[PDB]
Design a protein around this nucleic acid. Structure first.
Ligand SMILES: [Mg+2]
Ligand SMILES: [Mg+2]
Ligand SMILES: [Mg+2]
Ligand SMILES: [Mg+2]
Ligand SMILES: [Mg+2]
Ligand SMILES: [Mg+2]
Ligand SMILES: [Mg+2]
Ligand SMILES: [Mg+2]
Ligand SMILES: [Mg+2]
Ligand SMILES: [Mg+2]
Ligand SMILES: [Mg+2]
Ligand SMILES: [Mg+2]
Ligand SMILES: [Mg+2]
Ligand SMILES: [Mg+2]
Ligand SMILES: [Mg+2]
Ligand SMILES: [Mg+2]
Ligand SMILES: [Mg+2]
Ligand SMILES: [Mg+2]
Ligand SMILES: [Mg+2]
Ligand SMILES: [Mg+2]
Ligand SMILES: [Mg+2]
Ligand SMILES: [Mg+2]
Ligand SMILES: [Mg+2]
Ligand SMILES: [Mg+2]
Ligand SMILES: [Mg+2]
Ligand SMILES: [Mg+2]
Ligand SMILES: [Mg+2]
Ligand SMILES: [Mg+2]
Ligand SMILES: [Mg+2]
Ligand SMILES: [Mg+2]
Ligand SMILES: [Mg+2]
Ligand SMILES: [Mg+2]
Ligand SMILES: [Mg+2]
Ligand SMILES: [Mg+2]
Ligand SMILES: [Mg+2]
Ligand SMILES: [Mg+2]
Ligand SMILES: [Mg+2]
Ligand SMILES: [Mg+2]
Ligand SMILES: [Mg+2]
Ligand SMILES: [Mg+2]
Ligand SMILES: [Mg+2]
Ligand SMILES: [Mg+2]
Ligand SMILES: [Mg+2]
Ligand SMILES: [Mg+2]
Ligand SMILES: [Mg+2]
Ligand SMILES: [Mg+2]
Ligand SMILES: [Mg+2]
Ligand SMILES: [Mg+2]
Ligand SMILES: [Mg+2]
Ligand SMILES: [Mg+2]
Ligand SMILES: [Mg+2]
Ligand SMILES: [Mg+2]
Ligand SMILES: [Mg+2]
Ligand SMILES: [Mg+2]
Ligand SMILES: [Mg+2]
Ligand SMILES: [Mg+2]
Ligand SMILES: [Mg+2]
Ligand SMILES: [Mg+2]
Ligand SMILES: [Mg+2]
Ligand SMILES: [Mg+2]
Ligand SMILES: [Mg+2]
Ligand SMILES: [Mg+2]
Ligand SMILES: [Mg+2]
Ligand SMILES: [Mg+2]
Ligand SMILES: [Mg+2]
Ligand SMILES: [Mg+2]
Ligand SMILES: [Mg+2]
Ligand SMILES: [Mg+2]
Ligand SMILES: [Mg+2]
Ligand SMILES: [Mg+2]
Ligand SMILES: [Mg+2]
Ligand SMILES: [Mg+2]
Ligand SMILES: [Mg+2]
Ligand SMILES: [Mg+2]
Ligand SMILES: [Mg+2]
Ligand SMILES: [Mg+2]
Ligand SMILES: [Mg+2]
Ligand SMILES: [Mg+2]
Ligand SMILES: [Mg+2]
Ligand SMILES: [Mg+2]
Ligand SMILES: [Mg+2]
Ligand SMILES: [Mg+2]
Ligand SMILES: [Mg+2]
Ligand SMILES: [Mg+2]
Ligand SMILES: [Mg+2]
Ligand SMILES: [Mg+2]
Ligand SMILES: [Mg+2]
Ligand SMILES: [Mg+2]
Ligand SMILES: [Mg+2]
Ligand SMILES: [Mg+2]
Ligand SMILES: [Mg+2]
Ligand SMILES: [Mg+2]
Ligand SMILES: [Mg+2]
Ligand SMILES: [Mg+2]
Ligand SMILES: [Mg+2]
Ligand SMILES: [Mg+2]
Ligand SMILES: [Mg+2]
Ligand SMILES: [Mg+2]
Ligand SMILES: [Mg+2]
Ligand SMILES: [Mg+2]
Ligand SMILES: [Mg+2]
Ligand SMILES: [Mg+2]
Ligand SMILES: [Mg+2]
Ligand SMILES: [Mg+2]
Ligand SMILES: [Mg+2]
Ligand SMILES: [Mg+2]
Ligand SMILES: [Mg+2]
Ligand SMILES: [Mg+2]
Ligand SMILES: [Mg+2]
Ligand SMILES: [Mg+2]
Ligand SMILES: [Mg+2]
Ligand SMILES: [Mg+2]
Ligand SMILES: [Mg+2]
Ligand SMILES: [Mg+2]
Ligand SMILES: [Mg+2]
Ligand SMILES: [Mg+2]
Ligand SMILES: [Mg+2]
Ligand SMILES: [Mg+2]
Ligand SMILES: [Mg+2]
Ligand SMILES: [Mg+2]
Ligand SMILES: [Mg+2]
Ligand SMILES: [Mg+2]
Ligand SMILES: [Mg+2]
Ligand SMILES: [Mg+2]
Ligand SMILES: [Mg+2]
Ligand SMILES: [Mg+2]
Ligand SMILES: [Mg+2]
Ligand SMILES: [Mg+2]
Ligand SMILES: [Mg+2]
Ligand SMILES: [Mg+2]
Ligand SMILES: [Mg+2]
Ligand SMILES: [Mg+2]
Ligand SMILES: [Mg+2]
Ligand SMILES: [Mg+2]
Ligand SMILES: [Mg+2]
Ligand SMILES: [Mg+2]
Ligand SMILES: [Mg+2]
Ligand SMILES: [Mg+2]
Ligand SMILES: [Mg+2]
Ligand SMILES: [Mg+2]
Ligand SMILES: [Mg+2]
Ligand SMILES: [Mg+2]
Ligand SMILES: [Mg+2]
Ligand SMILES: [Mg+2]
Ligand SMILES: [Mg+2]
Ligand SMILES: [Mg+2]
Ligand SMILES: [Mg+2]
Ligand SMILES: [Mg+2]
Ligand SMILES: [Mg+2]
Ligand SMILES: [Mg+2]
Ligand SMILES: [Mg+2]
Ligand SMILES: [Mg+2]
Ligand SMILES: [Mg+2]
Ligand SMILES: [Mg+2]
Ligand SMILES: [Mg+2]
Ligand SMILES: [Mg+2]
Ligand SMILES: [Mg+2]
Ligand SMILES: [Mg+2]
Ligand SMILES: [Mg+2]
Ligand SMILES: [Mg+2]
Ligand SMILES: [Mg+2]
Ligand SMILES: [Mg+2]
Ligand SMILES: [Mg+2]
Ligand SMILES: [Mg+2]
Ligand SMILES: [Mg+2]
Ligand SMILES: [Mg+2]
Ligand SMILES: [Mg+2]
Ligand SMILES: [Mg+2]
Ligand SMILES: [Mg+2]
Ligand SMILES: [Mg+2]
Ligand SMILES: [Mg+2]
Ligand SMILES: [Mg+2]
Ligand SMILES: [Mg+2]
Ligand SMILES: [Mg+2]
Ligand SMILES: [Mg+2]
Ligand SMILES: [Mg+2]
Ligand SMILES: [Mg+2]
Ligand SMILES: [Mg+2]
Ligand SMILES: [Mg+2]
Ligand SMILES: [Mg+2]
Ligand SMILES: [Mg+2]
Ligand SMILES: [Mg+2]
Ligand SMILES: [Mg+2]
Ligand SMILES: [Mg+2]
Ligand SMILES: [Mg+2]
Ligand SMILES: [Mg+2]
Ligand SMILES: [Mg+2]
Ligand SMILES: [Mg+2]
Ligand SMILES: [Mg+2]
Ligand SMILES: [Mg+2]
Ligand SMILES: [Mg+2]
Ligand SMILES: [Mg+2]
Ligand SMILES: [Mg+2]
Ligand SMILES: [Mg+2]
Ligand SMILES: [Mg+2]
Ligand SMILES: [Mg+2]
Ligand SMILES: [Mg+2]
Ligand SMILES: [Mg+2]
Ligand SMILES: [Mg+2]
Ligand SMILES: [Mg+2]
Ligand SMILES: [Mg+2]
Ligand SMILES: [Mg+2]
Ligand SMILES: [Mg+2]
Ligand SMILES: [Mg+2]
Ligand SMILES: [Mg+2]
Ligand SMILES: [Mg+2]
Ligand SMILES: [Mg+2]
Ligand SMILES: [Mg+2]
Ligand SMILES: [Mg+2]
Ligand SMILES: [Mg+2]
Length: 51
RNA sequence: UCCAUAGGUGCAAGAGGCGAACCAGGGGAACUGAAACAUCUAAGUACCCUGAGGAAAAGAAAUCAACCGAGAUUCCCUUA
RNA sequence: AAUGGGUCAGCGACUUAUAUUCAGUGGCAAGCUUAACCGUAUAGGGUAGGCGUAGCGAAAGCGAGUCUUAAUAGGGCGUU
RNA sequence: AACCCACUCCCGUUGAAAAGGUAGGGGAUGACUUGUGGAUCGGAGUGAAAGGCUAAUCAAGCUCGGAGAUAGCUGGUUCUCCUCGAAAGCUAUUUAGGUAGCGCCUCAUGUAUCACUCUGGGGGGUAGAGCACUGUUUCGGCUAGGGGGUCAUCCCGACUUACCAAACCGAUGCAAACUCCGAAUACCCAGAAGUGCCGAGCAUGGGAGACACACGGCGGGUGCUAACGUCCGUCGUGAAA
RNA sequence: UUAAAAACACAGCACUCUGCAAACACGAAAGUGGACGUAUAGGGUGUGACGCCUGCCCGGUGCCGGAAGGUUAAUUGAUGGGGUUAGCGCAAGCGAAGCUCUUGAUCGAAGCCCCGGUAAACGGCGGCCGUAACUAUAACGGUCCUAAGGUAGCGAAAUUC
RNA sequence: UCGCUGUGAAGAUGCAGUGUAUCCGCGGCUAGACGGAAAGACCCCGUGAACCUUUACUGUAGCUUUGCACUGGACUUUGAGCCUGCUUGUGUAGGAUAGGUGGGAGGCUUUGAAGCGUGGACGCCAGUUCGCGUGGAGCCAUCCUUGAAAUACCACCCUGGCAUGCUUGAGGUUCUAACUCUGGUCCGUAAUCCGGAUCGAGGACAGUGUAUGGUGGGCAGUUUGACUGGGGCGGUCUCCUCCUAAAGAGUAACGGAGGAGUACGAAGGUGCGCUCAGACCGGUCGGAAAUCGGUCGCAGAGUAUAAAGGCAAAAGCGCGCUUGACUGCGAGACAGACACGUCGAGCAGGUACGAAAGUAGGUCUUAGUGAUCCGGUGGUUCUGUAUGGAAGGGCCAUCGCUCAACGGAUAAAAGGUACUCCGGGGAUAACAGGCUGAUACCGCCCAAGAGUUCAUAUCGACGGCGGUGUUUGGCACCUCGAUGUCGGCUCAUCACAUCCUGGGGCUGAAGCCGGUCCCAAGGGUAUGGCUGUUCGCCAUUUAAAGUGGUACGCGAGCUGGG
RNA sequence: GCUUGACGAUCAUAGAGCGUUGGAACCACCUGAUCCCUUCCCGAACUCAGAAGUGAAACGACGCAUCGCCGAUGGUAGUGUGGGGUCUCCCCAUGUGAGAGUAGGUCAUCGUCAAGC
């Protein structure tokens, strides 16, 4: 079943998004551009551990 | 058991028992509430026991405050 | 053909204390009111305290504003 | 026999008696019966064991205290007149005979809306109807084809379809979970006349009760279109006339 | 004080515990019974004169013995990570010694896991296929499972619908 | 203070209609007053109670393990630490030997006694250390070659292992002086208690305090859901779709049918482009069904996942680019007890596609879910108990429940009661009454057929229509502050759907006997064996051994076998 | 008013099917694939440069009711209110009133703009 993950900003802020994924099917990480509220720009977010 | 100790007799002085409550201690429930019930509550209450007094207890900061200060203990009204 | 009462006389069930809210009726009025306690004792004193005159925010705080927010934009609450 | 016991019948049952009597019955030198004095007791004693007995009380004695334990459960609640007037529903609940918010009653304050009819706008998929879809029914015609055989062809060509037959054409029925169609009524909305007991609507506060409903008509499920059956919707009456 | 019996006891039988300050029981304890007894004794448990007998299963749950290994308490405190501040630094920030907050290496018995016994310990003791000179039935063969598949006796029974 | 028949909270002295009847005792009998007595004991309910059980939960007495204390000496085995000489340092490599660093570049202390080696050895073994066997004797040649740095030389630490030292974990043995003795003899003393003394035995064990693991129904406080055509057993309990549902919304049943407790980094956004299923004809192995060509067809396909409502600007299909599955909000609504829920134009920041107008705050829509408390993680213009910090708290983001009994009592919980008890209920079962009549029983309609032929003498298949309250049931209206339930005895009373006796028609009625139907209720209508039996089966009778109602008549009339 | 193109209004009385007809202009077919651009292959489609040919295909216009689609009048079914019966179903008074079918209609009717008369 899908497991929760965190998406941490590449900037120095501590902002993060949250979602889930299928680890068995797609085993690589996710690199997706999102808006960072603290710096008010679109930056790249990287997968991390929910726990 | 040598010493002297336990022990044994004689004198004096005191205590012992009773009392409704109050006071300082020792021991210490459950029903009940939680709309069930174990933590919790009821409650350190009921009850039992021991001492004292006309009262008792506590009392003269190894205390509080907050950089300004207060000045032993007890009781009342607020802070609440 | 469900309950209660053989009858009479007497007795027998919404109380009291303390904290409060609303209404009626009064005293003062941007102020109102004292508690313990003194007392010439139902008087008078005692205004420590309580409520009101300003709100918003979790708070620091700022204030007819304030909070949220990058935002004197929008919106919540408040102000004649 | 005495003495200890208690198997049977009857009487008695407001008794002579809160366990007896008459007539029969068992043991009767023993694990016997009995007097006096003594010991063990309340989660404790004693018991050749029946949960028996512990002062006519025992699956935990009596007495006084905690104590007016607690009781969503029964019962009861005392003088008079006037105005108004319910509910037995929805939601949640270790909830279902309790309670809480909302709906329904009453009182106060404020404020401007309401009801009935006429006219004008609006959506619908019910009753009915139908077969255009999805299922289901019958008749006839027309047929691919399976094949009923077929001269029996070593086994392949066929003579024909004497059985069955998709599909198509026409006729003809049915449907809560079918629809090419489709009302009445009921619901929203607006504009108007009058009536309203002088108000109807709405908002905010004080006080509730109630959340076991019953039958009758109409529309339904369930049942046997059985029940003074039962479970909904909508009216009327009883409740409370 | 509605049940006198098939219920309880019983003599006999068996298992098990106990070496004496006994096991065991009543007692916060002192002590007392057991017992002024001593394994031919004392306690508990079941069965219930006598006769003939008392079959199979140690997988479960108890009890008994074993000690190699695994897991394992309080206790102890290696290691790592923080807080404070003499100092250094323009600053940001680094920071010795003390004190202090967490972390948790190592040490550690019984028990449990393991190995083996024990049923007059608590308990348990099966199915399906073929097969005989008529039929029928299977002495006989396969096969599944189990710790093992009920023996001797008795049986429409105080048990049988 | 009458009977009957109806009615009626459904079994009436009291109501309706009607019939009977002067007023009042005494002796008797018990059919009724749902007669008296005991707030039903059966049954259900109460977030009632007792007592009992156990591998329910949570604990506990007792028993047992180990640490510390009371609690000491010696010897020995042994792990760890520590001190000293540290002599040990044998690799590719070098005559020979590598852990390195500074003084140091040759050693001249009996030279550095010399070639092998003697006594002892170790040795990645043939190398090195220790008196040259004689004795006061020229060997290591200092990069002499090689080796990553040549020894000689003063110092800085350890390494394979030894000796001792002061400590230290465990093990065994012993000693006596702590402790213990429910062992002897002396004294207090006139004493099987108790002390003190002294002998004997055990002995740092036992035992007790405190801390800790195990065991522990021996004992204790409790828990063990609700709905429900009575309870129990079974089933269900949250969410989505359709019907019921009566053409706005909503609407119940243990009513009729199905699904959910997910999926997807593309299955999302955008630009561009394109249409299906199926049928027929033609065409290599396939042949009804592969891929190819053509015509028809238009949605009979598809849509991640049930069903319903939708789908041409396709919401279906493919390709390029991509992250709007964005952050702060939010006019206004829909739903609604609350807590929750649903839709959304527009504004501000930053984006993505597209030439651009523009589109994008996930997916065609409606299921895919769980409050608060508590604890964890990342930030932070907050707070931080004298002060500066810090701990802890607040705010923002996020994680942990099949709390499925799904608004979730607690972090933590099963049973028995026939030994039972209290408060209640005809709000709710068992007996009898009531309503109903599926079923039961009794009639009738049709007539295939059986009856040698012949439908109806006697029967009668497949089907149909009634009657009675009479069986098994359905319901739950009366009674739980009590209406005694099977069978037997005693005593009855009524109906007729007649068993005998009486009167008739038909007959497949010769007679004697019968069969069937019609009329008729006056009177009659067995005894026994077995069983608690009513029934039933047997034996022997009789003219015959009727069927039913009456609280399945009758316990204030008896019994007590069930 | 006449013909052809673009965009609309309206969504079958406007559609389908059959027959006839249109190249002056427009439109369509057409030639080639150098150049922009394109095919998961192909200039088939998209695109570019015009122009020799034709109205065949397509499209438009005009005819026909064969199919489709519209469709009365009258009657019938249902139904709100009030009242009756023999009451599982109906009837009466009053208001309302389908679906199906029958007679019959239909080969559409309009607006803006630009090219030729
Ligand atoms: Mg003396
Ligand atoms: Mg005194
Ligand atoms: Mg006194
Ligand atoms: Mg005290
Ligand atoms: Mg005291
Ligand atoms: Mg105390
Ligand atoms: Mg309690
Ligand atoms: Mg309670
Ligand atoms: Mg309570
Ligand atoms: Mg309770
Ligand atoms: Mg509790
Ligand atoms: Mg507990
Ligand atoms: Mg307490
Ligand atoms: Mg006290
Ligand atoms: Mg005194
Ligand atoms: Mg004094
Ligand atoms: Mg005194
Ligand atoms: Mg005095
Ligand atoms: Mg004084
Ligand atoms: Mg004093
Ligand atoms: Mg003093
Ligand atoms: Mg000072
Ligand atoms: Mg002083
Ligand atoms: Mg009466
Ligand atoms: Mg009664
Ligand atoms: Mg009465
Ligand atoms: Mg009652
Ligand atoms: Mg009475
Ligand atoms: Mg009085
Ligand atoms: Mg007032
Ligand atoms: Mg005033
Ligand atoms: Mg504002
Ligand atoms: Mg405002
Ligand atoms: Mg006796
Ligand atoms: Mg006699
Ligand atoms: Mg006698
Ligand atoms: Mg005797
Ligand atoms: Mg004798
Ligand atoms: Mg004797
Ligand atoms: Mg005897
Ligand atoms: Mg005697
Ligand atoms: Mg005595
Ligand atoms: Mg006594
Ligand atoms: Mg007791
Ligand atoms: Mg006892
Ligand atoms: Mg007993
Ligand atoms: Mg007893
Ligand atoms: Mg018993
Ligand atoms: Mg007494
Ligand atoms: Mg007694
Ligand atoms: Mg008790
Ligand atoms: Mg109390
Ligand atoms: Mg009381
Ligand atoms: Mg009660
Ligand atoms: Mg209740
Ligand atoms: Mg009552
Ligand atoms: Mg009462
Ligand atoms: Mg009125
Ligand atoms: Mg209720
Ligand atoms: Mg009630
Ligand atoms: Mg309520
Ligand atoms: Mg219909
Ligand atoms: Mg029809
Ligand atoms: Mg059809
Ligand atoms: Mg329909
Ligand atoms: Mg309607
Ligand atoms: Mg008036
Ligand atoms: Mg009100
Ligand atoms: Mg209700
Ligand atoms: Mg009521
Ligand atoms: Mg109702
Ligand atoms: Mg009801
Ligand atoms: Mg009703
Ligand atoms: Mg009805
Ligand atoms: Mg009904
Ligand atoms: Mg009915
Ligand atoms: Mg009813
Ligand atoms: Mg009704
Ligand atoms: Mg009414
Ligand atoms: Mg009336
Ligand atoms: Mg009336
Ligand atoms: Mg009422
Ligand atoms: Mg009336
Ligand atoms: Mg009324
Ligand atoms: Mg007896
Ligand atoms: Mg006897
Ligand atoms: Mg007896
Ligand atoms: Mg007995
Ligand atoms: Mg003993
Ligand atoms: Mg023995
Ligand atoms: Mg014994
Ligand atoms: Mg026995
Ligand atoms: Mg026996
Ligand atoms: Mg016996
Ligand atoms: Mg026996
Ligand atoms: Mg075993
Ligand atoms: Mg074994
Ligand atoms: Mg062992
Ligand atoms: Mg610091
Ligand atoms: Mg620092
Ligand atoms: Mg430090
Ligand atoms: Mg260890
Ligand atoms: Mg061990
Ligand atoms: Mg054995
Ligand atoms: Mg046995
Ligand atoms: Mg045998
Ligand atoms: Mg037998
Ligand atoms: Mg048996
Ligand atoms: Mg009568
Ligand atoms: Mg009557
Ligand atoms: Mg009468
Ligand atoms: Mg009367
Ligand atoms: Mg009358
Ligand atoms: Mg009357
Ligand atoms: Mg008389
Ligand atoms: Mg009599
Ligand atoms: Mg009588
Ligand atoms: Mg009676
Ligand atoms: Mg009675
Ligand atoms: Mg009572
Ligand atoms: Mg009762
Ligand atoms: Mg409960
Ligand atoms: Mg309850
Ligand atoms: Mg118990
Ligand atoms: Mg337990
Ligand atoms: Mg313990
Ligand atoms: Mg210890
Ligand atoms: Mg002893
Ligand atoms: Mg020891
Ligand atoms: Mg020990
Ligand atoms: Mg201990
Ligand atoms: Mg127990
Ligand atoms: Mg117990
Ligand atoms: Mg217990
Ligand atoms: Mg309790
Ligand atoms: Mg309980
Ligand atoms: Mg519970
Ligand atoms: Mg229940
Ligand atoms: Mg049931
Ligand atoms: Mg019901
Ligand atoms: Mg029922
Ligand atoms: Mg029901
Ligand atoms: Mg019922
Ligand atoms: Mg509706
Ligand atoms: Mg409706
Ligand atoms: Mg609805
Ligand atoms: Mg309802
Ligand atoms: Mg999609
Ligand atoms: Mg669909
Ligand atoms: Mg794409
Ligand atoms: Mg995205
Ligand atoms: Mg938007
Ligand atoms: Mg934007
Ligand atoms: Mg762009
Ligand atoms: Mg909690
Ligand atoms: Mg501080
Ligand atoms: Mg912090
Ligand atoms: Mg629940
Ligand atoms: Mg719930
Ligand atoms: Mg719910
Ligand atoms: Mg809900
Ligand atoms: Mg609770
Ligand atoms: Mg219980
Ligand atoms: Mg009772
Ligand atoms: Mg009661
Ligand atoms: Mg009832
Ligand atoms: Mg009920
Ligand atoms: Mg019955
Ligand atoms: Mg009866
Ligand atoms: Mg009955
Ligand atoms: Mg009945
Ligand atoms: Mg009944
Ligand atoms: Mg015949
Ligand atoms: Mg005949
Ligand atoms: Mg009857
Ligand atoms: Mg009946
Ligand atoms: Mg009933
Ligand atoms: Mg009921
Ligand atoms: Mg009912
Ligand atoms: Mg009755
Ligand atoms: Mg009853
Ligand atoms: Mg009564
Ligand atoms: Mg009669
Ligand atoms: Mg007759
Ligand atoms: Mg007869
Ligand atoms: Mg005859
Ligand atoms: Mg007959
Ligand atoms: Mg007769
Ligand atoms: Mg007769
Ligand atoms: Mg007669
Ligand atoms: Mg007669
Ligand atoms: Mg006569
Ligand atoms: Mg007889
Ligand atoms: Mg018999
Ligand atoms: Mg005869
Ligand atoms: Mg009779
Ligand atoms: Mg009877
Ligand atoms: Mg009878
Ligand atoms: Mg009797
Ligand atoms: Mg009887
Ligand atoms: Mg009697
Ligand atoms: Mg009677
Ligand atoms: Mg009677
Ligand atoms: Mg009698
Ligand atoms: Mg009996
Ligand atoms: Mg018409
Ligand atoms: Mg009507
Ligand atoms: Mg009409
Ligand atoms: Mg028409
Ligand atoms: Mg039509």
């Amino acid at each position: 079943m899908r497991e929760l993950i965190r998406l941490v900003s590449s900037a120095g802020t501590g902002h993060f998004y949250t979602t889930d994924k299928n680890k068995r099917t797609k085993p690589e990480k996710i690199e997706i551009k999102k808006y960072d509220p603290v710096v008010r720009q679109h930056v790249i977010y990287k997968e991390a551990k929910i726990k």
